[PDB]
């Protein structure tokens, strides 16, 4: 039978009972980053305290 | 007639477009940098041709306006012997050669060099255009621009470029041959059309050596000669001054009475 279609009544009151929780803090993610930038940042992290020329002097051609 | 609502709703274009001086669609695509680079605005070789001279500038965009990095004019070619034909193809080449040797003698060679880009502006990009002669002059002076030689004379393919048929355009051998045959067949028409050539004493057979000698002297000493031009507040009296508001009212009330 024909009845009520829609309301937003009591929705703000419901949504504030457990509050509007924030975005939950996380570790920083590489999701959404530029791929050329992210590839280069990991290369800088891979050869952080030892340079690349010294790293490939040890481990050979690293690619 | 045109209604008053026309003028009130009229949105004027940008002032350099109303002046007909910049192509703002072309300008937008030219100075656009990737957002990954953030500050490194690209340098562009802007070549402008006037009726008198040929302007070549290396310049970079800022927020307040473009900042000039290097400048050369074809009027600066008088030091190198070229006083004749200041807007021909060879003056375009030599002025493009001049910024390229100025900009390289300005910066020192410890780091890598940035790429420059050619800015024609509103000239037409035709084969044999002078604006690409200034491009070809800049590449010969060592300015790195991502060109292709399709519009400079001497082009047959992307791998093959004929330097010899480029050189007769460059060293005026096309021009001198036209200048020589006019002198023989129509000596009075030669007298009228090349007046500043004769007063400079230039001869068409001599013309290749003047250009070849100029190209060495540019690459040897491209350094800028400076002119101080200290005071010009003498010229301040040449401008007119505006009236005041009550003087404008005094002429208006007088115009009502007569």
């Amino acid at each position: 039978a024909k009845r009520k279609n829609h309301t937003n009544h009591n929705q703000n009151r419901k949504n504030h009972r457990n509050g509007i929780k924030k975005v939950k803090k996380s570790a920083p993610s590489f999701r959404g980053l530029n791929h050329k930038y992210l590839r280069n940042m990991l290369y800088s992290r891979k050869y952080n305290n030892i340079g690349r020329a010294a790293y490939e002097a040890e481990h050979g051609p690293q690619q | 007639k045109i209604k008053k609502s026309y003028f009130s709703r009229f949105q004027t274009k940008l002032r350099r477009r109303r002046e007909g001086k910049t192509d703002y669609k072309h300008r937008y695509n030219l100075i656009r940098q990737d957002v990954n680079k953030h500050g490194l605005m690209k340098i562009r070789l802007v070549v402008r041709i006037t009726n008198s001279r040929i302007i070549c500038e290396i310049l970079r965009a800022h927020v307040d306006g473009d900042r000039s990095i290097a400048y050369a004019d074809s009027t600066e070619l008088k030091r190198y012997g070229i006083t004749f034909g200041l807007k021909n193809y060879t003056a375009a080449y030599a002025t493009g050669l001049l910024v390229a040797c100025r900009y390289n003698n300005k910066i020192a060679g410890e780091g890598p060099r940035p790429e420059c880009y050619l800015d024609i502006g509103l000239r037409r990009s035709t084969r044999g255009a002078r604006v690409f002669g200034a491009m070809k002059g800049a590449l010969d002076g060592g300015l790195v621009m991502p060109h292709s030689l399709k519009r400079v004379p001497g082009y047959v393919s992307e791998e093959e470029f004929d330097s010899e048929v480029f050189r007769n355009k460059l060293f005026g051998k096309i021009l001198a041959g036209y200048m020589k045959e006019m002198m023989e067949n129509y000596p009075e028409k030669y007298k009228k059309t090349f007046q500043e050539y004769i007063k400079k004493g230039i001869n068409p057979d001599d013309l290749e050596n003047i250009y070849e000698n100029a190209f060495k002297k540019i690459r040897e000493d491209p350094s800028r000669v400076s002119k101080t031009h200290g005071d010009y507040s003498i010229f301040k009296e040449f401008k007119r001054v505006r009236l005041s508001k009550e003087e404008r009212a005094a002429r208006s009330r007088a115009k009502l009475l007569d």
């Binding site: 419901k14 949504n15 504030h16 009972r17 457990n18 509050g19 509007i20 929780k21 924030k22 975005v23 999701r31 959404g32 980053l33 530029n34 930038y37 | 709703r9 009229f10 949105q11 274009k13 940008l14 703002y24 669609k25 300008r27 937008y28 100075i31 656009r32 940098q33 990737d34 957002v35 990954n36 953030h38 500050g39 605005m41 965009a61 800022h62 927020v63």
Partner: protein, 160 residues
């Protein structure tokens, strides 16, 4: 009940201002953008590519990613009882560098400088809180050359 296209109900939101139509000026290309910087998404409707959703047209978010022609922006949205972080990809024509923390950065760099300089000379500054507007000050208004003026109720008259 309205249809749910990507630009629904944007007749005024995605319009141009009066006598401010046209393609964007090249001066926007000289704006720097950095990761962590806050930006205001305000859509340039002359630029049709890289347009964000209409929901983010008033919103301000922090940049997480910087691309060739575009920018990734972190913007929280209410989904019921939670804020959900959306990743908004927008062309630079649709954003402005936000002045949300404009006066905080001006306050911070000066105060951190003053704390560094005072620590250099062996002093220290206790607290540089922004003091709010307190009570009113005591006033002295002299009636010398300022005589009090009577305000009276006046008879109602009507003009027609």
């Amino acid at each position: 009940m309205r249809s749910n296209g990507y630009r629904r109900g944007t007749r005024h939101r995605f319009s141009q201002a009066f006598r401010k139509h046209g393609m964007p000026k090249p001066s926007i290309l000289t704006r720097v953008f950095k990761k962590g910087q806050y930006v205001d998404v305000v859509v340039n409707p002359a630029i049709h590519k890289g347009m964000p959703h209409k929901f983010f047209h008033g919103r301000t978010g922090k940049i997480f990613n910087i691309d060739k022609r575009s920018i990734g922006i972190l913007m929280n949205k209410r989904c019921g009882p939670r804020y959900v972080e959306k990743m908004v990809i927008a062309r630079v024509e649709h954003v402005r560098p936000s002045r949300c923390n404009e006066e905080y950065i001006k306050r911070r760099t000066e105060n951190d400088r003053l704390r560094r300089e005072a620590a250099a000379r062996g002093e220290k500054l206790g607290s540089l809180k922004r003091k709010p507007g307190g009570p009113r000050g005591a006033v002295l208004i002299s009636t010398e050359n300022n005589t009090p003026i009577e305000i009276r109720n006046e008879p109602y008259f009507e003009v027609y």
